[PDB]
């Protein structure tokens, strides 16, 4: 049940780098469940300050990561990410 419930479409963050869209963090709420993205899935790990100013154009370098048991493990790549609205 956990798998089906959590196989929900989820909004991702965009970027101007021409690379894949990525989850903001590694959790997503759908169908009454706080879901965890699968291990290895691409994510952005933004600081609290970066999240506060996150908007519809890039204004900070966003740390790329991979999800691992709910943590977005940064890999050192930086991207110009932004939210779609």
């Amino acid at each position: 049940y956990e798998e089906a419930r959590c196989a929900c479409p989820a909004r991702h963050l965009n970027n101007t780098n021409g690379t894949v869209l990525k989850l903001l963090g590694c959790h997503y709420f759908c169908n009454g469940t706080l879901c965890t993205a699968p291990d290895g899935y691409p994510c952005y790990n933004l600081t609290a300050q970066q999240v506060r100013t996150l908007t519809t154009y890039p204004n900070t370098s966003c740390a790329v990561g991979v999800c691992m048991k709910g943590t977005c493990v940064k890999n050192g790549t930086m991207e110009q990410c932004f939210k779609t609205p």
């Binding site: 798998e3 089906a4 959590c6 989820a10 991702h12 997503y28 879901c35």
Partner: protein, 63 residues
């Protein structure tokens, strides 16, 4: 939904009698190409189009 993507797929086949329709995720930049089935309980379920049962149900719902 231009940046809406499926991060997880359902692993087991959804019974055919429980499906209403489907759509594809429209960003080519989604990490995982996906189809989104809509069920009789008004749920949206992500499915992997590389699986044959997903391909077959797509053809079924198309007719």
């Amino acid at each position: 939904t231009s940046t809406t993507c499926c991060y997880r797929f359902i692993n087991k086949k959804i019974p055919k009698q429980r499906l209403e329709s489907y759509r594809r995720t429209t960003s080519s930049h989604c990490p995982r190409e996906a189809v989104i089935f809509k069920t009789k309980l008004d749920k949206e379920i992500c499915a992997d189009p590389t699986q044959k049962w997903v391909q077959d149900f797509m053809k079924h719902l198309d007719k």
